[model samples]
Target chain A: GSEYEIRKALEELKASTAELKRATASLRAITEELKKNPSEDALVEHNRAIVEHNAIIVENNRIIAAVLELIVRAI
Target chain B: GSEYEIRKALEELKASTAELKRATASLRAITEELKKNPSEDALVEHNRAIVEHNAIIVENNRIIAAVLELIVRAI
Candidate 1:
């Protein structure tokens, strides 16, 4: 139980980083622009970014719980 | 103002990772075996770890909104 929680939290923390990376991928993917009206594609990708970010929050919540529980065991 | 939030969030996220690093530092610091008496040292590091993680949360919350702000800026 102890080791499991510790390892799981570690993995979850890493995965949360992955999700954050994905969310930013959208931003980084933004139109390489010139027409100045690529706003349409920008809107689409930004929405994807929002959805991906929600995952970051959910994972952060899990990370917090896991870490707190981990503290209990370690203490 | 716009760029500030985006940049601030990015930096906070990075800093949060640092705090998390500190928290784990204590775990890594914890009793390095043998005498089994080094538990004292472990406790000290673990307390530092907890304080560090508190900072992580504060930063994460800010990152969440910064990401959100970025989304608004893009949209």
Candidate 2:
């Protein structure tokens, strides 16, 4: 059970990690291609990624609280 | 490199996940204890634990974003 849950959560966490990869790659490429490229959009996305990533963290914490409740009650 | 990074990241992510497990265990225990003998501090701590666990998740996400950037740049 520990192994399964750990694997699943890690997978999801890895999935969520792409948020920055997607934005950063685009920003870098755009910067390289267009000398005067617009980067505000990319910057905005970066901030959004921060918020989204934090939300994921909060969600994980909530789940932890629930699991704790379950385990503690079980015992 | 992918395998190494994935494994490393997974380990770190798992580390962060313990935050939830800790809170949940405490929550369940507190709730049970309250049933036997109530304490306001227990309840307050329960809520705080939940918040604390969530904060861990956010931290995990931040690391993820940074890793993603590294990956994207490498590619």
Candidate 3:
């Protein structure tokens, strides 16, 4: 049903939002520590983490966009 | 030169990282408020905001991924 799809999409969106929150928290931790003691190695690692986070963010965006498009059409 | 490309990429990455930081902060604020006062209208608005955030995240991912790949190949 239409309601089920909307609910499911919302649930998935919430999950992705939670994932983003956690990733940002982790990134912020690295950023905070780097403010205290910056190093070449840590910087590389931090950049790599940011890249990975963006990868996840990309996929989440696609999922949410598709779901929203569907919801709009259904509405 | 190789050094120039690397520096340019790092600059771009930093810019994207800063953008992500701001987006995450905005999302967090919405999340916090929803936690305090949940409502149907608010929930819809929050969901819409999340969708927009994801859209930005997707583009950031593409930019970061390309820059990182270039850096890796250059190295």
Of the candidates shown, which would achieve the greatest lDDT relative to the real structure?
A: 3
Query: Arrange candidates by TM-score, highest first: which order?
Result: 3, 1, 2
- Residue A25 of model 2 has an lDDT of 65
Q: For candidate 1, lDDT tens digit of each residue in B9-39?
A: 7777887777677766655555344136544
For model 3, the DockQ equals 0.03
Please, what is the whole-model Cα lDDT of each candidate in the order they appear? 0.53, 0.50, 0.65
lDDT of 3 by residue, A1-75 (tens): 878887888888789888989999999999999889976555545544655576567556555544534443453
Candidate 3 DockQ category? incorrect
Candidate 1 error regions (>4 Å): A31-36, B1-75
- The residue-by-residue lDDT of candidate 1 on A1-75, one tens digit each, is 665666566566656766665554543434222123344454455445445556675776767566556656655
DockQ of predictions, in order shown: 0.02, 0.04, 0.03
Lowest-scoring 10 consecutive residues by lDDT in candidate 2 chain B? Answer: B66-75
Fraction of true inter-chain Cα contacts (below 8 Å) kept per model?
0.00, 0.03, 0.03
Q: Candidate 3: give the clashing pairs.
A: none
lDDT per residue as tens, model 2, B8-71:
6545656666654565455456545544554456445544654665666567566555545544
Global local distance difference test of model 1: 0.53
Tens digit of per-residue lDDT, candidate 2, span A20-74: 4565565566556545553544333333333334445455444443333233223
